Design a protein around this ligand. Structure first.
Ligand SMILES: Nc1ncnc2c1ncn2[C@@H]1O[C@H](COP(=O)(O)OP(=O)(O)O)[C@@H](O)[C@H]1O
Ligand SMILES: [Mg+2]
Lengths: 97, 337, 289
């Protein structure tokens, strides 16, 4: 509930993230459910391999940031392609008529 | 023209429908990538699959987050050319080291390496050869004047210092560099280090190479820096050797694919010019579309290029099946080796 | 307890629970001390008679007038209220120490097992209301009487120790106090989100800062919410934060001067002062002595 509540505030701050409002509420839960799943594996990895990987609430704030940086950048590439496509699809459709 | 244009529209349409579909799938795609970069680093090859392909992928489908079903990480995050470059630098061909390569480039936190044998170090030395200097850039954690000689100089200048022999426990004076907390005055970006402000350039880089098999780091340390396991495993050397055998045995087949893929990536770019050239020139031309011979020519010329590319991307897919069959047949040599 | 709470002011039913409090906490304390044993890890677990003092300190900081105002404010019998206060202060002393979430859920059993048998007269009305899952938390700053129009022009808020029924009702108050801190302290911004578990930690800190002769010790892996929630609790609590400035010139002599400025503020003039320390601020072990 904490990780999901932190993930809720981060998605609201994220203005360039363009998706369904339903999907954003599924993402919030996923972001959090990831940070638990890593702690669950960190404990499993110590029992099976005797290696201790430590994940802290600071390492969740790092994930959320890292998520936005790669999204913003990857959306900027995709969005400028789709706009260079979409200028095409209008002018060609007019040419066809 | 009606037959040709409707053809040209249906090539544009289908690509936009794929770019639109790629944006819909991006929310999951980025979530499944960025989770891998931040968390999966410190684990071995077996557990990175468990932590990503068995755990996160299962969560996505259940939650209803739009994600591409396969989502090959290596393909999505970095181009196939830049993988080729790291191989020349000396990042091995095996899947684990490629991922370790991606984590170093994409991580906002300063990368730490676990490598007991400097395979991860020998890569970050060969790469960043320009911004690294042999003398007065590499130091150990403990040096008489570590701070004033190496650290202070490498920040001021903006040179890529590589901390050697970290030996588990990190010094507390380094903490405010790792945190990246900056008291900005203009554009200097002065960072206090044991109560002394130091001019940090944006082009400064830090790498921290542990030379121990199983180092027990503190949660505060693991949160400040992205830990990456660069240790050579039997499973990893198997994948390296299997690359080396396939380069030697059935070389003619493997090389003809690398030549084809490289000529395919060219013809994708070459078709991106001609369809662009049409868009640019069909607006500029305007009236009397029937007489416009210099436009007319390219609309039929785009189609032959679009037909050519399509027929290489079918033959490309056949040669990836053919080489993967050989990859299974010559597996026994590599896993024995 | 018999001096601080007089028969005259209370109902006959409320006062039968006030007499029960003194016998109840001991029954609980014996159960909790017998079950949670000190070990190499979980060394602090050992329960003294400081941990009895500290329960009652909390109970006696809730005034006679807020217990008698539980039927109007909390909308529960005042005798029922009183058990919630007990349960809370019993939890804050005993259950907060506990390192893992499994050891907590054992102790929340003992606090319910005792509350039913000690308070038999209201057993059926305790059992239905008070769970570990359901929240009934206490804070001095609940009262929104601080309007903050061109500073604190409208007297101040009486810092009375009142119960909050829901975390959502509290979040609106605690989010308001966070936004107001960032206004008053603009140089050092504090971008923080108050999730259910952070609110709970803020109250816990703003209890420990609010009790007289009560220091704290916030043990967390790091990035856990300690320093941020402390400075907010110190802001809300209207007391002066003090933090050690670590420089290579600064030594055990300069600490002593920074502590002396603390006593110059605290013992002299009569200001509440909340000296803050961390792993980072302890340069050498001698500072911690
Ligand atoms: N709910 C939260 N939202 C955002 N940041 C948080 C939250 N909880 C803790 N933090 C982060 O914790 C970091 C350290 O502060 P804190 O955890 O209060 O102290 P400490 O350094 O002692 O762990 C801050 O950088 C802050 O951003
Ligand atoms: Mg910390």
């Amino acid at each position: 509930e904490a990780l999901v509540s932190v993930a809720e505030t981060f998605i609201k701050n994220f203005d360039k993230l363009d998706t369904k409002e339903e999907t954003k509420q599924e993402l919030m839960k996923h972001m959090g459910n990831v940070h638990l799943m890593v702690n669950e594996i960190c404990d499993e990895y110590y029992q099976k391999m005797r290696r201790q990987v430590y994940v802290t609430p600071k390492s969740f704030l790092s994930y959320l940031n890292s998520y936005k940086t790669l999204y913003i950048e990857k959306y900027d590439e995709l969005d400028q392609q789709e706009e260079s496509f979409k200028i095409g699809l209008n002018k060609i459709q007019e040419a066809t008529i | 023209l009606i037959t040709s244009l409707s053809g040209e529209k249906d090539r544009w349409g289908k690509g936009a429908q794929d770019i639109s579909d790629q944006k819909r799938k991006l929310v999951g795609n980025v979530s499944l990538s960025t989770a891998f970069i931040s968390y999966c680093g410190p684990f071995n090859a077996e557990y990175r699959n468990k932590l990503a392909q068995q755990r996160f992928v299962v969560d996505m489908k259940k939650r209803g987050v739009p994600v591409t079903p396969g989502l090959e990480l290596t393909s999505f995050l970095i181009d196939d050319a830049t993988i080729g470059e790291w191989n020349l630098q000396g990042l091995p061909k095996d899947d684990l080291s490629i991922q370790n390569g991606i984590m170093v480039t994409n991580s906002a936190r300063y990368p730490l390496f676990i490598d007991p044998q400097g395979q991860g170090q020998n890569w970050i030395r060969n790469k960043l050869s320009a911004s690294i200097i042999p003398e007065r850039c590499i130091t150990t954690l403990s040096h008489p004047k570590f701070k004033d000689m190496f650290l202070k100089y490498c920040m001021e200048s903006g040179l890529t210092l590589i901390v050697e022999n970290i030996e588990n426990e990190v010094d507390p004076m380094m903490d405010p560099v790792l945190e990246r907390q900056i008291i900005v005055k203009g554009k200097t970006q002065f960072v206090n280090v044991a109560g002394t402000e130091m001019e940090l350039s944006k082009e400064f880089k830090l790498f921290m190479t542990c030379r121990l098999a199983n180092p027990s780091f503190s949660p505060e340390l693991s949160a400040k820096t992205t830990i990456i396991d660069f240790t050579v495993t039997q499973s990893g050397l198997e994948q390296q050797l299997l690359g080396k055998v396939i380069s030697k045995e059935q070389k003619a087949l493997e090389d003809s694919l690398n030549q084809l893929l490289a000529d395919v990536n060219q013809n994708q770019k070459d078709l991106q010019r001609l369809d662009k050239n049409l868009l640019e020139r069909l607006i500029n031309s305007q009236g009397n579309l029937l007489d416009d011979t210099e436009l007319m020519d390219v609309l039929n010329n785009t189609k032959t290029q679009a037909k050519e590319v399509a027929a290489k991307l079918i033959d490309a897919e056949i040669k990836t099946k053919e080489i993967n069959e050989k990859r299974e047949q010559y597996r026994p040599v590599a896993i024995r080796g | 307890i018999k001096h601080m709470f007089k028969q005259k002011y209370f109902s006959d039913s409320t006062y039968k629970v006030i007499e029960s409090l003194t016998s109840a906490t001991i029954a609980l304390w014996n159960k909790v001390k017998s079950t949670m044993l000190p070990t190499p890890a979980k060394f602090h677990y050992v329960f003294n008679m400081r941990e009895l003092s500290r329960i009652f300190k909390g109970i006696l900081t809730c005034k006679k007038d807020t217990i008698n105002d539980a039927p109007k404010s909390m909308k529960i019998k005042p005798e029922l209220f009183l058990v919630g206060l007990w349960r809370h202060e019993a939890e804050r002393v005993l259950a907060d120490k506990l390192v893992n979430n499994k050891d907590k859920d054992t102790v929340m059993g003992y606090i319910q097992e005792v509350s039913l048998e000690s308070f038999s007269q209201i057993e059926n009305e305790i059992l239905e209301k008070y769970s570990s899952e359901k929240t009934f938390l206490f804070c001095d700053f609940l009262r929104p009487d601080v309007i903050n129009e061109d500073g604190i022009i409208e007297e101040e808020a009486p810092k009375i120790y009142e119960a909050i029924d829901s975390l959502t009702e509290l979040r609106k108050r605690c989010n308001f106090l966070l936004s107001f801190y960032n206004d008053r302290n603009p140089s050092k911004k504090m971008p923080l989100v108050l999730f259910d578990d952070a609110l709970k930690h803020l109250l816990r800190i703003s209890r420990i800062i609010r009790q007289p002769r009560s220091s704290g010790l916030l043990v967390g892996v790091g990035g856990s919410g300690k320093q941020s929630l402390t400075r907010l609790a110190g802001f809300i609590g209207k007391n002066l934060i003090q933090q050690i400035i670590v420089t290579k010139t600064y030594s055990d002599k300069d600490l002593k001067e920074d502590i002396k400025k603390g006593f110059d503020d605290a013992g002299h003039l009569g200001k509440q002062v909340t000296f803050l320390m961390t792993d980072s601020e302890v340069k050498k072990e001698e500072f911690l002595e």
